[PDB]
């Protein structure tokens, strides 16, 4: 393993799931209508 990719690979499998947006989305609460609209206003970005 040594070094180099060890930090890049992990970063790759970590970038796939997207931990950032998954629990950042649940960082502060929202209404259901608002959330729905938000999700709608986007699908292929």
């Amino acid at each position: 393993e040594s070094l180099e990719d060890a930090l890049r690979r992990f970063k790759r499998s970590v970038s796939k799931s997207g931990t950032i947006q998954e629990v950042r989305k649940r960082e502060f609460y929202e209404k259901p209508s608002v959330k729905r609209k938000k999700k709608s206003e986007a699908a292929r970005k």
Binding site: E1, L3, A6, L7, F10, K11, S13, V14, S17, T19, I20, E22, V23, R24, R26, E27, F28, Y29
Partner: protein
């Protein structure tokens, strides 16, 4: 003075802090290092360099007993969790893996609101 050379690590780089705890195979506590316990505060804990001296310390203090190989486990979404491990590899260890972790609920409950 429990000694092996393949322990395991649990990590957490919060928005406001980034800390360490090194445990054994099962495991159980041996040491930890608070960025705040290194004089820092505030956001000064949240900076990556705080985790350098911390993880260096509890890595060092833990290989006092003697530990080189290890496995790693990282929740705590924040900055330090990719720089201070480039300080970790300099710490005297032989990392065998690094496993992501994060608590995913399944629409469980409420967070706060403001702002």
């Amino acid at each position: 003075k429990k000694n092996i050379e393949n322990g395991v690590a649990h990590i957490r780089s919060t928005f406001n802090n980034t800390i360490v705890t090194i445990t054994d195979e099962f495991g159980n506590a041996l040491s930890w290092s608070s960025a705040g316990a290194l004089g820092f505060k505030g956001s000064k804990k949240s900076t990556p360099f705080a985790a350098q001296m911390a993880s260096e310390t509890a890595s060092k203090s833990a290989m006092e007993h003697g530990l080189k190989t290890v496995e790693v486990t990282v929740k705590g979404p924040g900055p330090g969790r990719e720089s201070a491990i480039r300080a970790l590899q300099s710490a005297g260890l032989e990392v065998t893996a690094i496993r992501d972790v994060t608590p995913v609920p399944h629409n469980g409950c409420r967070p706060p609101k403001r702002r």
